[PDB]
Design a protein around this ligand. Structure first.
Ligand SMILES: COc1ccc(CC(=O)Nc2cn([C@H]3C[C@@H](NC(C)=O)C3)cn2)cc1
Length: 278
């Protein structure tokens, strides 16, 4: 750690604290996260090879006085803050589209290597002045806010799939569009009931096997599904059709990232430049 010079505290992943920092030798400005089991060391090392333009570059992993430091490339803003800054006007649709598309490319990549994110959230989607958006916190959940949690996780499935990331990203896509989080649950049961209230209480018809899940209860209230035209209103038919497929209850019916990149919604995808200020 002697090689780094802390500049400012950037946030707290509650994994540890994150600092904006400068590399004394390189001159590089990076994000240092202060986090050690051998298993964690080996899984972290494999994250060092999972390089993609839409994944925050893990630069180095330092382990000393048995404390763990992750050195990432630094990005100047995150999607939570950009959404909050774009709240009066809303992010332009072409920019929503480009961000969704790039995150899907990032997810198609990790998922093809069998790596899952497990905790997507606007705060860990980082953006730069060039129009790029990147997945961050990536792979660390296997290694070491419920609003984006997929329902199979909340119902207690132990062996959930890459579909949990598609669910999370659909919720983020809806929030970009409406400027309000989709399912702002403040407890696990509140999160599940907010989902049920919008998409209908799941049953064996739409989700085979749902009733045998560990935390599934036959006493759950039975709500009717609503339509997506009422849930993400401004969005066109292509976008709403894609969102409904990213939000299918059954994890096996939910669209994959790779198939989502082929959806008609991306026919006119472009890469606009965002208006940022730091
Ligand atoms: C004015 O202060 C700020 C505040 C926030 C930000 C954006 C940001 O968070 N950038 C960032 C994080 N990382 C790594 C992602 C790693 N975080 C975790 C928890 O994995 C740090 C790289 N670039 C920029 C400046």
């Amino acid at each position: 750690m002697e090689n780094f010079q802390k500049v400012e505290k950037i946030g707290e992943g509650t994994y540890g604290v994150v600092y904006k920092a400068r590399n004394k030798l390189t001159g590089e400005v990076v994000a240092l996260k202060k986090i050690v089991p051998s298993t964690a060391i080996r899984e972290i090392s494999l994250l060092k090879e999972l390089n993609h333009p839409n994944i925050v570059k893990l630069l180095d992993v330092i382990h000393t006085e048995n404390k763990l430091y992750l050195v990432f490339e630094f990005l100047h803003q995150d999607l939570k803050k950009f959404m909050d800054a774009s709240a009066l006007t809303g992010i332009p649709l072409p920019l929503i589209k480009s961000y969704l598309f790039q995150l899907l490319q990032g997810l198609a990549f990790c998922h093809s290597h069998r790596v899952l994110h497990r905790d997507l959230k606007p705060q860990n989607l980082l953006i730069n002045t060039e129009g790029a958006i990147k997945l961050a916190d990536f792979g660390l959940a296997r290694a070491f806010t419920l609003w984006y949690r997929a329902p199979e996780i909340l119902l207690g499935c132990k062996y959930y799939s890459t579909a949990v990331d598609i669910w999370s990203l659909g919720c983020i896509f809806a929030e970009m569009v409406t400027r309000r989080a989709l399912f702002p649950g403040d407890s696990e049961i509140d999160q599940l009931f907010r989902i049920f209230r919008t998409l209908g209480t799941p049953d064996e018809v739409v989700w085979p096997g749902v009733t045998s899940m560990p935390d599934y209860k036959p006493s759950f209230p039975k709500w009717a599904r609503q339509d997506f035209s009422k849930v993400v209103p401004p969005l066109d038919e292509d976008g709403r059709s894609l969102l409904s497929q990213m939000l299918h209850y059954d994890p096996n019916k939910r669209i994959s990232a790779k198939a989502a990149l082929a959806h008609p919604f991306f026919q006119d995808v472009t890469k606009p430049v965002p208006h940022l200020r730091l």
